[PDB]
Structure formats: C-alpha cells, structure tokens
Fold this sequence. Notes:
The protein has about 130 residues and is α/β, with parallel strands linked by helices. It has one domain (about 1-133): Sandwich (Immunoglobulin-like), CATH 2.60.40. About 15% of the residues lie in helices and about 30% in strands. The chain has helices spanning about 60-65, 70-85; strands at about 10-15, 25, 40, 45-55, 70, 100, 110-115, 125-130. A five-stranded mixed β-sheet has the order 3-1-8-5-6. Strands 2-4-7 form a three-stranded mixed β-sheet, with no helix packed on it. The longest helix has 14 residues, at about 70-85. It is globular. Bound molecules: calcium ion (CA), chloride ion, copper (II) ion (CU) and sodium ion (NA) (2 copies). Keywords: Copper, Disulfide bond, Electron transport, Metal-binding, Periplasm, Signal, Transport.
Amino acid sequence: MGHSALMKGTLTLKGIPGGAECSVDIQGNDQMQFNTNAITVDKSCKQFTVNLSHPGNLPKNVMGHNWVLSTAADMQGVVTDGMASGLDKDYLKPDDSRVIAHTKLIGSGEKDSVTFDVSKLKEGEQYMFFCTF
Ligand SMILES: [Ca+2]
Ligand SMILES: [Cl-]
Ligand SMILES: [Cu+2]
Ligand code: NA
Ligand code: NA
C-alpha cells in the first residue's frame, strides 16, 4: 500500500572522478514512478540539492509524491510511521530523526527542492530515497 515499494532507489556517496555538479532533477508521475532508481552524490560536494517535480494531472491526495532520504536500515520505519502520520503531515512523522532530508508532498503541476549537507552522509553507508505516500 502506498508508493514506497515502487518509488524508491539507492543514494550513494562516491568519489566521482573529477567532481560532479551537486544536484539531481527527479520526477514522480501519474503512474507511481520516479524517473531514476539510483543517485550518486560526489564526496567533494558540500551541499546536494534534489529538485522534485510532478508532471501529469493527478492531485496530491490521489497521487502525491515526496522525496525522502534515510539509511536503508531506517527506510521501513520511516515509511511505516510516515504512512500512519497521514496526508495532512505529508506522510512523514514530524521531526523524524531518521530522515536525513525531505521535500514536501506535491501533486500535479507542483515543484519542490531540498538541499542538504553532504557531511550528513558517509562513504560505505547504504542510503535509500523514496516516496512515503
Ligand atoms: Ca521543501
Ligand atoms: Cl497506493
Ligand atoms: Cu509518491
Ligand atoms: Na569528485
Ligand atoms: Na546533476
């Protein structure tokens, strides 16, 4: 139930040869899909920015999407507690210690960005991004 089983992917801190730009553009659509399942963040990025958008036509209460980052070990807990927190809390437990970064929940035609400190990540750790809707 909800989007997290399908709308998820890995996020990995790596030394990308030569550096990389410090953002990613990601979309969630009307078919419960993100347009990537693997994001790499370069070590030398001080901040990283995720720009989420929602193309198509369905409203937030039917096909709402957020982008939520946690350790892979913490994902299930965040999803469970987020689902229980409900639509009016953007399907996130308020102040959840396990959420490294998150956007708001968006419907069709909306956009949201989140920037976070890359020092909150560690090489070797498994991170997941996901929608908790
Ligand atoms: Ca935001
Ligand atoms: Cl659903
Ligand atoms: Cu979603
Ligand atoms: Na690099
Ligand atoms: Na980029």
